[PDB]
Amino acid sequence: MAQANFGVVGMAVMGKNLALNVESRGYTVAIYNRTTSKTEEVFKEHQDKNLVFTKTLEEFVGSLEKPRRIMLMVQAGAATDATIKSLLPLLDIGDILIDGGNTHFPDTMRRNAELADSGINFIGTGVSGGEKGALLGPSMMPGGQKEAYDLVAPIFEQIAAKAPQDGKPCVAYMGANGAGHYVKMVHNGIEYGDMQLIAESYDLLKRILGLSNAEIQAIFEEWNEGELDSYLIEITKEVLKRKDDEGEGYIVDKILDKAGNKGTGKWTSESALDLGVPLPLITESVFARYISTYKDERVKASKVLSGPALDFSGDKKEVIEKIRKALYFSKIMSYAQGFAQLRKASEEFDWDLPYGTIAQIWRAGCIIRAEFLQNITDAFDKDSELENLLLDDYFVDITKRYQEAVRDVVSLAVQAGTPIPTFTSAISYYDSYRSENLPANLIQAQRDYFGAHTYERTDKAGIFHYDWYT
Amino acid sequence: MAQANFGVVGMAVMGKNLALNVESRGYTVAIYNRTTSKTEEVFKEHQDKNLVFTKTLEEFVGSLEKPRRIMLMVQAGAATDATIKSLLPLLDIGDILIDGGNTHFPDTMRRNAELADSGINFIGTGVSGGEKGALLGPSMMPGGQKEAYDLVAPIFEQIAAKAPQDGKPCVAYMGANGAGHYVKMVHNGIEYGDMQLIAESYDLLKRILGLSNAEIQAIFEEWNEGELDSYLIEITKEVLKRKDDEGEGYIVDKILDKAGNKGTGKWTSESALDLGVPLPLITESVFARYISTYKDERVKASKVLSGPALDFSGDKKEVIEKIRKALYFSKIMSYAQGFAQLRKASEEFDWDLPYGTIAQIWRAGCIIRAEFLQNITDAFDKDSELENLLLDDYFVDITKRYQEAVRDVVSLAVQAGTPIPTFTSAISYYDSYRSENLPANLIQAQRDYFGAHTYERTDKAGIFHYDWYT
Ligand SMILES: O=C(O)[C@H](O)[C@@H](O)[C@H](O)[C@H](O)COP(=O)(O)O
Numbered sequence: 001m002a003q004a005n006f007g008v009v010g011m012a013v014m015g016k017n018l019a020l021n022v023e024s025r026g027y028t029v030a031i032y033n034r035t036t037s038k039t040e041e042v043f044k045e046h047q048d049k050n051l052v053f054t055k056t057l058e059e060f061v062g063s064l065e066k067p068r069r070i071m072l073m074v075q076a077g078a079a080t081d082a083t084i085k086s087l088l089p090l091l092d093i094g095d096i097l098i099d100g101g102n103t104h105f106p107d108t109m110r111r112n113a114e115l116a117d118s119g120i121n122f123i124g125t126g127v128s129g130g131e132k133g134a135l136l137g138p139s140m141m142p143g144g145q146k147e148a149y150d151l152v153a154p155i156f157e158q159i160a161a162k163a164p165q166d167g168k169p170c171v172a173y174m175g176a177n178g179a180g181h182y183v184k185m186v187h188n189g190i191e192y193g194d195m196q197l198i199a200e201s202y203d204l205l206k207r208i209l210g211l212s213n214a215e216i217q218a219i220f221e222e223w224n225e226g227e228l229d230s231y232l233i234e235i236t237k238e239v240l241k242r243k244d245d246e247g248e249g250y251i252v253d254k255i256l257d258k259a260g261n262k263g264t265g266k267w268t269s270e271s272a273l274d275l276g277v278p279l280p281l282i283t284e285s286v287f288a289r290y291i292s293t294y295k296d297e298r299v300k301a302s303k304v305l306s307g308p309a310l311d312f313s314g315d316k317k318e319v320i321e322k323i324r325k326a327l328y329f330s331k332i333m334s335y336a337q338g339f340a341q342l343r344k345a346s347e348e349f350d351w352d353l354p355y356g357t358i359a360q361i362w363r364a365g366c367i368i369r370a371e372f373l374q375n376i377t378d379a380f381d382k383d384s385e386l387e388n389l390l391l392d393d394y395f396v397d398i399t400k401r402y403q404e405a406v407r408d409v410v411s412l413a414v415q416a417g418t419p420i421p422t423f424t425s426a427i428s429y430y431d432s433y434r435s436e437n438l439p440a441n442l443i444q445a446q447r448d449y450f451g452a453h454t455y456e457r458t459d460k461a462g463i464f465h466y467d468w469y470t
Numbered sequence: 471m472a473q474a475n476f477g478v479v480g481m482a483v484m485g486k487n488l489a490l491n492v493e494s495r496g497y498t499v500a501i502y503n504r505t506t507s508k509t510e511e512v513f514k515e516h517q518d519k520n521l522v523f524t525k526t527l528e529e530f531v532g533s534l535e536k537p538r539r540i541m542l543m544v545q546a547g548a549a550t551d552a553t554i555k556s557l558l559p560l561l562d563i564g565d566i567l568i569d570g571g572n573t574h575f576p577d578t579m580r581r582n583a584e585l586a587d588s589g590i591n592f593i594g595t596g597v598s599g600g601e602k603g604a605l606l607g608p609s610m611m612p613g614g615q616k617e618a619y620d621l622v623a624p625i626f627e628q629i630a631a632k633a634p635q636d637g638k639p640c641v642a643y644m645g646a647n648g649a650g651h652y653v654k655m656v657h658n659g660i661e662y663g664d665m666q667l668i669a670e671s672y673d674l675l676k677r678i679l680g681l682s683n684a685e686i687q688a689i690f691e692e693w694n695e696g697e698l699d700s701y702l703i704e705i706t707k708e709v710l711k712r713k714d715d716e717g718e719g720y721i722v723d724k725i726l727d728k729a730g731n732k733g734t735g736k737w738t739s740e741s742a743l744d745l746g747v748p749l750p751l752i753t754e755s756v757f758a759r760y761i762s763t764y765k766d767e768r769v770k771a772s773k774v775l776s777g778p779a780l781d782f783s784g785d786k787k788e789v790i791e792k793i794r795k796a797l798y799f800s801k802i803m804s805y806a807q808g809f810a811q812l813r814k815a816s817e818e819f820d821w822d823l824p825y826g827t828i829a830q831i832w833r834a835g836c837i838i839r840a841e842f843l844q845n846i847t848d849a850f851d852k853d854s855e856l857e858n859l860l861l862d863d864y865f866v867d868i869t870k871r872y873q874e875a876v877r878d879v880v881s882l883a884v885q886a887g888t889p890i891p892t893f894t895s896a897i898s899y900y901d902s903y904r905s906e907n908l909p910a911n912l913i914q915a916q917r918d919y920f921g922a923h924t925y926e927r928t929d930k931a932g933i934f935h936y937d938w939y940t
């Protein structure tokens with residue numbers, strides 16, 4: 001009783017690895033899982049560690065120090081509500097529940113409010129870095145009551161990854177209620193976008209240039225020594241090494257091209273839509289997953305619909321470099337879009353999000369970890385109030401220099417008939433963002449024509465309606 | 471008392487014009503509005519007509535035949551709930567409330583259920599065609615209880631527009647509860663997409679080819695005599711005629727390029743996201759509106775960010791024709807996407823939507839009215855179970871023949887630096903849909919790598935996880 005410093009509910013791998021992460025920092029950790037068998041499997045395999053085995057929820061709670069720190073690592077949605085409901089009667093006022101699941105932020109906003117009514121603190125935290133990150137050092141995105149966060153921060157700072165630049169822990173207070181799960185949702189949105197960008201690059205190298213997994217692996221390896229340096233490119237060249245475990249060739253080539261999803265990317269796009277925020281790249285990424293889901297229909301369509309025939313007339317080495325430039329340029333478009341979303345959300349939900357710190361805590365631990373996140377944190381260091389990453393001098397320059405290459409890649413791919421939905425949205429966003437005038441004047445004219453919706457003018461203040469008919 | 475055949479609540483223009491539409495078919499119509507002054511303005515201007523002036527809600531209800539038919543034409547959201555709440559105690563079981571507002575369908579699903587608990591019928595109806603359509607002949611998309619719909623159908627069939635092909639009324643039963651507002655939501659989604667497609671075509675003709683409003687008007691006029699024949703192109707060339715009412719030149723050129731929206735397009739995209747349905751074109755259209763909203767930022771970015779310089783080396787007449795082909799091709803992509811959404815929604819909410827009839831009732835009255843809607847109704851006539859419009863022989867052929875032109879337009883626009891977010895998503899969707907294999911295999915590999923998310927194989931049944939680490 002009161003021997004454990006911290007508790008984890010949910011002994012699937014994420015929750016197990018997190019419990020192990022905490023323990024490895026010199027704490028005693030009570031472990032609990034709904035089906036007792038899984039808790040026993042963890043406990044026996046890790047008997048050497050300072051883990052307290054609990055079989056009932058009261059035994060779990062009873063084993064914890066006041067104020068209790070309990071991390072929930074269960075299935076998002078109804079399973080998380082059920083766990084909270086099960087825990088609530090066993091807790092005392094001042095106790096701290098932490099939801100580390102990939103929860104949709106409005107649920108966190110609702111959970112925070114109702115748990116406050118019972119005098120229980122609720123910290124909705126994003127945990128990024130996969131199963132290995134949860135064990136060795138995640139990026140963490142906590143939101144909720146500051147006072148409660150301050151009580152958990154020491155442990156969070158110990159388990160989190162350190163940025164290689166300055167050794168800063170990749171965790172920080174995001175803000176009130178759902179602020180942390182919101183940032184995490186944007187993280188995953190951006191993740192989808194990067195993976196889709198990398199998929200298109202892979203597809204271009206494979207279909208237009210006819211290159212092999214070994215060749216593409218070497219290209220990604222070389223890319224990762226430069227400004228593109230990121231965890232996602234790293235695991236890409238790694239995935240491309242691996243043999244099929246049940247046949248000839250490579251495992252990547254035997255995986256069915258139907259991308260799964262567990263909601264976060266979709267939620268990011270849904271939020272952008274809600275907020276009035278242009279988020280084309282990450283949204284196209286989500287839709288790219290959905291269209292891969294339509295495999296059966298795609299098989300049928302392949303036999304019916306025609307495309308261009310491919311004979312590549314250019315220089316491989318220099319086209320590879322154009323694609324490299326287009327990848328980096330396009331990532332900049334997507335992060336630019338993503339941070340503008342965080343900005344509008346911060347205003348909408350009154351979170352006063354620390355944009356530069358968000359960048360800082362993504363430098364290590366998280367899936368989107370990359371060297372260029374330092375560049376993003378520098379832009380916000382210069383101007384905390386920066387409206388868009390593209391107006392920072394580092395990114396102005398890159399876009400100035402890489403856009404010619406993007407245009408060439410877009411033309412090549414489109415004429416070859418290779419699908420590049422995110423590369424194309426990348427350049428479209430750039431040309432829209434930089435246009436002083438867009439053809440939305442005509443859209444407003446049509447709207448006023450059929451619907452009397454009114455418009456503003458270019459030459460004077462006020463709201464106007466035109467007599468289109470009389 | 472019981473003299474009026476039908477009632478309209480909401481004397482803004484849509485509701486007034488609808489009340490007038492009904493009256494003009496030989497019915498007596500009771501009119502009501504929250505602020506009495508507006509009802510008086512309508513009544514006096516239309517004293518000749520068979521309108522019953524009501525000043526209180528009881529007077530309005532008391533004036534109607536049992537079972538009462540009351541159409542609500544008020545602001546969507548809370549104003550519609552408030553009107554329902556105000557009406558409910560004055561009604562008798564069997565009465566029929568009809569919500570003709572642009573209501574988000576889940577509100578209709580909720581409203582239908584709770585009103586059924588009180589024995590009141592609820593018909594959520596989409597009304598399309600603008601203020602002029604509401605007066606002269608809308609397209610109508612009713613959902614709710616069939617028995618209640620059958621009682622209102624005679625009047626709906628009279629007020630609705632007739633298809634010029636076969637004189638069929640542009641109204642039909644869509645299905646239960648929210649089915650009608652869902653179809654209407656998709657209608658407006660598709661509308662956004664067409665307007666954005668037309669905006670890009672306009673922008674290309676204006677910026678790349680340096681053409682004038684008179685020139686572009688003549689191009690759209692000629693286009694509208696062919697297969698592109700549609701109401702939206704019609705009002706486009708019409709808008710392009712009109713002089714500035716407060717200065718020199720044309721009104722279109724003095725309208726501020728900030729597209730407004732009232733939710734429906736956003737809801738369409740949000741629904742596609744929910745359903746797992748690829749809807750890139752209509753979604754890019756929504757985002758195109760959002761980015762025009764960012765005018766202040768765009769002004770700043772124009773001064774900082776660089777693009778290519780434009781010198782057009784080609785033949786105007788033939789580039790115009792390529793753009794024409796690209797417009798038609800892209801509309802086909804968007805409707806294809808839109809009908810696939812209706813298909814997944816029908817399954818999700820158990821509506822058994824009549825896809826061919828939906829096409830039929832969009833042939834006239836609605837904003838997206840066009841000759842090619844007959845082609846869509848023919849595709850569903852052939853196969854009611856058709857998975858995607860692109861697998862119909864009429865559209866297979868068009869895409870086969872127009873895709874070369876789209877690729878050329880995309881290349882031209884991208885190299886010129888003119889933003890074409892929907893033209894580019896159009897070709898990306900086509901090349902994705904027709905690909906037997908997509909690079910989503912790599913996405914699944916990365917997901918399994920960092921998150922152990924599992925995959926399916928190309929060569930055998932079952933779910934697999936790979937040992938990426940040991
Ligand atoms: O940052 C991370 O550690 C991952 O993103 C993590 O949140 C998990 O892997 C999710 O499943 C998201 O990915 P999916 O939506 O593609 O499943």
Ligand SMILES: O=C(O)[C@H](O)[C@@H](O)[C@H](O)[C@H](O)COP(=O)(O)O
Binds near residue numbers: 837
């Ligand atoms: O079909 C119609 O008659 C219109 O679409 C109508 O529903 C109205 O004009 C809306 O306002 C939609 O357009 P917005 O979202 O652009 O306002």
Ligand SMILES: C[As](C)(=O)[O-]
Binds near residue numbers: 451452453454
């Ligand atoms: C001003 As209006 C016709 O959008 O309600």
Ligand SMILES: C[As](C)(=O)[O-]
Binds near residue numbers: 921922923924
């Ligand atoms: C099978 As899994 C790691 O997506 O819960």
